[PDB]
Amino acid sequence: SQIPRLSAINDLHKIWPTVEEHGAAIIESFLSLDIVRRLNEEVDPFVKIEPIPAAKTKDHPNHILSTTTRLVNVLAPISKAYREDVLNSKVLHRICSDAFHVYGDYWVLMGAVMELAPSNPAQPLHRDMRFSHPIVEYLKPDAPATSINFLVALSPFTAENGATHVILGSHKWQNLSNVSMDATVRALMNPGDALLITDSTIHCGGAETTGTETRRLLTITMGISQLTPLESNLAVPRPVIESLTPLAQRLLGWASQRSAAPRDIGLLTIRGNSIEKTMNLKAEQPL
Amino acid sequence: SQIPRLSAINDLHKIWPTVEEHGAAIIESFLSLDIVRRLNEEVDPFVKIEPIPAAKTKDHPNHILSTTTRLVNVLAPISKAYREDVLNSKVLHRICSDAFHVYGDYWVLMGAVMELAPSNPAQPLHRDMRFSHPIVEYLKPDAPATSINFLVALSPFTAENGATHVILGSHKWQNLSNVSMDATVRALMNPGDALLITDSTIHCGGAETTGTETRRLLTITMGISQLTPLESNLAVPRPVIESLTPLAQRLLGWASQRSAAPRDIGLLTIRGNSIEKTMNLKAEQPL
Ligand SMILES: CN1C(=O)c2ccccc2NC(=O)/C1=C/c1ccccc1
Numbered sequence: 001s002q003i004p005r006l007s008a009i010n011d012l013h014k015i016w017p018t019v020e021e022h023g024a025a026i027i028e029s030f031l032s033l034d035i036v037r038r039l040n041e042e043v044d045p046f047v048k049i050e051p052i053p054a055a056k057t058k059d060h061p062n063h064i065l066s067t068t069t070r071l072v073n074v075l076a077p078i079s080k081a082y083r084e085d086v087l088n089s090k091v092l093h094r095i096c097s098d099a100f101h102v103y104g105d106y107w108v109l110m111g112a113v114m115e116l117a118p119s120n121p122a123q124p125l126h127r128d129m130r131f132s133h134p135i136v137e138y139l140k141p142d143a144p145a146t147s148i149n150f151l152v153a154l155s156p157f158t159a160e161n162g163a164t165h166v167i168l169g170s171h172k173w174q175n176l177s178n179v180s181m182d183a184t185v186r187a188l189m190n191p192g193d194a195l196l197i198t199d200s201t202i203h204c205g206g207a208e209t210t211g212t213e214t215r216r217l218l219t220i221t222m223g224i225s226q227l228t229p230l231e232s233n234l235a236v237p238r239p240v241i242e243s244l245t246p247l248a249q250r251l252l253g254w255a256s257q258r259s260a261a262p263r264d265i266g267l268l269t270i271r272g273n274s275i276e277k278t279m280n281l282k283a284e285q286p287l
Numbered sequence: 288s289q290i291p292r293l294s295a296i297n298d299l300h301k302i303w304p305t306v307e308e309h310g311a312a313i314i315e316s317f318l319s320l321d322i323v324r325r326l327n328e329e330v331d332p333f334v335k336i337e338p339i340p341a342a343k344t345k346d347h348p349n350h351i352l353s354t355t356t357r358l359v360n361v362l363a364p365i366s367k368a369y370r371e372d373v374l375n376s377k378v379l380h381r382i383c384s385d386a387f388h389v390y391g392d393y394w395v396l397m398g399a400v401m402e403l404a405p406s407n408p409a410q411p412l413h414r415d416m417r418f419s420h421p422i423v424e425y426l427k428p429d430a431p432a433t434s435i436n437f438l439v440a441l442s443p444f445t446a447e448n449g450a451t452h453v454i455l456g457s458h459k460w461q462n463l464s465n466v467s468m469d470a471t472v473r474a475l476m477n478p479g480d481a482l483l484i485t486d487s488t489i490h491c492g493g494a495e496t497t498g499t500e501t502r503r504l505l506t507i508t509m510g511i512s513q514l515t516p517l518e519s520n521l522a523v524p525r526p527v528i529e530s531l532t533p534l535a536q537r538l539l540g541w542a543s544q545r546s547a548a549p550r551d552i553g554l555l556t557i558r559g560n561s562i563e564k565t566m567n568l569k570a571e572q573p574l
Pocket residue numbers: 062064065110112123124126127128129130131219221552
């Protein structure tokens with residue numbers, strides 16, 4: 001049986017319950033083709049200049065991604081489409097509040113464009129967050145997901161060009177002795193479609209077999225505000241931050257956060273007041 | 288049997304193993320009387336002006352602390368003694384690296400001065416982190432502590448003036464039906480002594496019974512860099528940050544962090560580079 005497909009607009013209330021059950025769901029038209037085109041245009045040059053993941057020039061090398069992979073994070077200052085349209089997506093926020101209501105506020109752990117060159121090999125079958133958040137390995141087996149990953153297609157995903165593999169139900173597996181490429185199904189997607197998985201869903205990038213096709217995706221890891229993001233927005237110029245909505249500012253860590261505890265005392269506060277009140281942080285100030 | 292007492296200097300290697308076993312240990316002369324006096328002097332006026340914890344002026348009210356309690360956090364910009372001496376304490380860093388090596392880097396979740404007025408009632412017996420980090424309630428029972436709390440005496444702790452109660456062994460309790468003030472022992476301390484507990488140690492502030500004594504403490508919650516701090520240093524002026532050591536800057540969240548994962552990809556990074564490299568962040572620049 002295949003990955004369930006849901007309409008971003010008509011099936012909005014079914015998306016999280018479907019992922020909680022099956023560990024994966026494909027959201028059709030998660031982003032419009034306009035947003036996809038504007039995103040591709042704004043990030044294009046940054047993909048071209050990006051060194052290899054484990055470049056000796058970096059003090060935080062990624063030794064896991066293949067040398068024919070380019071990853072570009074901290075998209076807020078590069079892309080107006082990302083910081084305005086993607087960060088304020090009504091679909092993303094309904095799914096995240098459905099998923100994370102038991103914990104409280106959520107933010108972006110990483111928003112990155114990944115481009116995978118022709119003849120890129122299949123990734124090993126894995127769960128996300130194991131190279132950054134060892135704490136998630138100590139959660140009780142039946143603990144609600146603390147992070148989820150929107151894999152948004154910025155180019156076509158096909159069986160031939162290395163569409164994502166997932167194992168349905170694998171987010172509930174404790175015994176991993178049935179893990180095999182034989183147990184997987186493929187996330188076939190048009191640009192703007194998104195594959196939504198949890199931090200427990202076993203998956204991998206597929207093998208590029210055409211030898212000519214370049215595959216590109218926008219990976220948005222959304223997590224509870226209690227977990228530290230993989231990326232920092234500390235160096236994002238303040239005029240850019242002040243052009244965002246209050247909601248977008250919170251997702252980038254430029255606001256105080258709240259837990260779901262009945263008498264929550266909050267996160268990233270300043271003597272009982274918020275970051276935004278303290279710094280007198282402006283919102284929606286056009287550049 | 289009483290809370291074990293250890294010398295900051297001669298018993299340094301025994302401090303964490305003692306806490307891991309008993310759930311509490313008193314560190315004699317954790318801070319020198321010089322540092323204690325300079326800290327008290329620099330924070331004095333900020334204690335006097337601080338409103339009630341649940342003041343209607345605050346957008347993050349603390350509804351749990353008694354109205355005869357004052358709490359002041361974000362100490363870096365107030366106190367030179369805190370930002371230079373306390374943040375670079377060789378004792379604190381040996382204990383934290385002993386406690387958190389399985390997880391990776393650690394930082395300050397909150398450094399606060401608490402002052403409790405005459406006739407302040409005893410707090411209810413509790414574990415810390417339940418009003419900010421509901422995620423810790425979902426960790427496996429035998430998961431290593433993700434945060435620890437140094438309760439540093441800034442004034443004398445006596446049975447009469449409301450010295451902390453702890454239940455020894457309570458950090459390993461799953462059944463909480465033996466929780467009673469009858470099961471507790473007291474943390475009797477001179478200024479500069481510290482009571483070290485885990486996030487699982489059941490404890491409470493004692494009742495002030497003299498009706499004249501004001502009790503003051505410096506509470507430093509140290510946690511794995513994977514957990515979000517209760518306080519923010521985002522608004523701390525950059526000249527102050529650039530006067531700190533590289534280690535102190537990391538503890539305040541003004542640097543990238545690393546997990547203990549063999550091929551760690553890191554936390555708060557910028558396209559494979561650190562905050563400090565990216566922003567060209569200076570260190571130990573005197574004001
Ligand atoms: C290493 N690695 C990443 O870099 C990565 C990239 C984008 C988004 C999340 C992310 N986190 C990971 O856990 C990850 C998994 C992974 C595992 C196996 C093979 C290749 C990747």
